[PDB]
Design an enzyme around this catalytic site. Sequence first.
Site, PDB file in Angstrom:
ATOM      1  CD  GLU A 186      -2.753  -1.512  -0.024  1.00 17.54           C
ATOM      2  OE1 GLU A 186      -2.931  -0.554  -0.836  1.00 17.54           O
ATOM      3  OE2 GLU A 186      -3.308  -2.622  -0.167  1.00 17.54           O
ATOM      4  CG  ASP A 347      -3.259  -2.753  -6.996  1.00 16.73           C
ATOM      5  OD1 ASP A 347      -2.907  -3.348  -5.957  1.00 16.73           O
ATOM      6  OD2 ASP A 347      -3.696  -1.582  -6.980  1.00 16.73           O
TER       7      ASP A 347
END
Length: 511
Positions: A186, A347
């Site tokens: 993250e 991602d």
Amino acid sequence: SHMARFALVLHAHLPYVRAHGMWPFGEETLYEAMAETYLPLIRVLERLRAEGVEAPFTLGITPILAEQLADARIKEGFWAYAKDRLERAQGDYQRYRGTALEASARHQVAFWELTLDHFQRLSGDLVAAFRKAEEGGQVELITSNATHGYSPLLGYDEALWAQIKTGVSTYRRHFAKDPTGFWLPEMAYRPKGPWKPPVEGPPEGVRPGVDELLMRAGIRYTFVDAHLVQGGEPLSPVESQEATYHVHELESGLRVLARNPETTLQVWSADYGYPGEGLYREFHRKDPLSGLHHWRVTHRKADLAEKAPYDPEAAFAKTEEHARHFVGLLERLAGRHPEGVILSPYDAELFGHWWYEGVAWLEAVLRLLAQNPKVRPVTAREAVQGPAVRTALPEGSWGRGGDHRVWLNEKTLDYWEKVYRAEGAMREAARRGVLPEGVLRQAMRELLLLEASDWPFLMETGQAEAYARERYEEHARAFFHLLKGASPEELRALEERDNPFPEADPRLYLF
């Protein structure tokens, strides 16, 4: 001449789903990503190597993903899943021949034939295929925390160390090389300084920065969000200030690159991102009999019932135009920031899985950039070379709000309580060395599994919070059971269910 450096970084990750159920979230989530993202990316890498196309980029495979990709149960399960999908596609072609859905159904049959053949030709070994692409120089491989733990909030330096070092050890075991790049889960970062836990009871005290532990583990660079280097509002309308185009060096010696706003929005925007183009395959409409996707986006605001039949030929062709459009944006950024660095981190499963045509888009972008006179595609290793701004980074993440709110909130306080209790108990157990070695190793696995950020990410999501709670509660329960006393056969059932990290080293908690 004086070209901008474009660093595409794909973060490939799924949490540990092996042996935990099949669907909606479970093993099938991994098989979907293997079929739609990882295998297609491998085929891009094979083609670029074969054709001598020089357009390198950076790929993260999280340790917990890699452990599953390398596992025998997962290899067998994928083979069975892909066989079943071919049969479903054949059945849909039988039903839809002579209808508007014929082209979609035909395409699905071809896709699953190709998937089975490729998987078979790889010996079912995706990790080996990625090692081979790194050896050929088409990609840099980077590692991450063992189970994608949320670095700034882990309660002990020893637990963060165990996450980092277990990741590095996993990369070394799979690839026979030391990693120099690291994906912070993250992009979540905390600098050196006083720290008070948000829940009882790790102790309050001065902690080293996450970067200092990375440096000690042999990591030399990572990736952070724009607002960590330029200040102001988090990207998750935030512009791209000068600082984001520079390499930054921290006091520890670690280097970081910052996420480029424009290239993120151009792909991710719910309103103008490429995946919302009407020709592309719609993810959220499933066939009532087979669950396959035979419809196109049509319009971003369209109801599911209003989605038109999918035309694969028109959809794949569209990626060429979007590749040129994206490269146009990179050129505009390069003109604004001569010889600067443009970091475009995503991602991985966005490409090929959520945006079905996205791997074809990546391939087209890379092929264009191989020939571009203004923008050079580079690995992260190359991107971080040369002059760096001396910088101190504030605490934050690439999540919503740019801080920890997604992972630390009223609905995750129970989660963090368990994590902290388990982290404290693991350290003590490792120090005592009285439990059998195997029990200590499996307790370590259960702690690492508990520490996955994937669980608390979902505690404010209505449709996922019950599932995520059962997962974290079970890894916590297993952890405490092992410490309190489990029979050998209870141990073996946990070892078989929860089997990442064959070389898990509890001595890391003595850091």
